[PDB]
Amino acid sequence: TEEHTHLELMPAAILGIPASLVPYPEHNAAPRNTYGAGMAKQSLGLGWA
RNA sequence: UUUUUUUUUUUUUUUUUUUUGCGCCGACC
């Protein structure tokens, strides 16, 4: 509106890198999202070539 | 013409059968 002084660029960018791995985080409970972000760093895969 | 020292015997071989501690960081239940 006219009263607004700034516009948000990306509301999904307020999360960290591990927290962005969770798909649809707004449909989950906050402790579940915290657990998912925590366990995202404990997974196994091709980390480095 | 002159005194105040004492005396005796009993103990054996060439030598022998496994890192503790200190502190930090991350993480699980």
User: At residue A16, what are phi and psi to the nearest 5 degrees?
Assistant: -80, 180
Q: With a 7 Å cutoff on the CB, does A16 touch strand B?
A: no
Q: Which residue is closest, via its CA, to the C1' of B27?
A: A42
Query: In A1-49, where does DSSP find H-type helix?
Result: 30-39
Cα–Cα dist A49/A29, whole Å: 35
Query: At how many Å resolution was this determined?
Result: 2.2
Our measurement of the distance from residue A37's CA atom to the centroid of its chain's CA atoms, rounded to an integer in Å, reads 8
Count, in order, helices (H) and strands (E) of chain A: 1, 0
Cα–Cα dist A8/A13, whole Å: 10
Using a 7 Å cut-off to protein CB atoms, list the covered nucleotides of chain B. 27-28
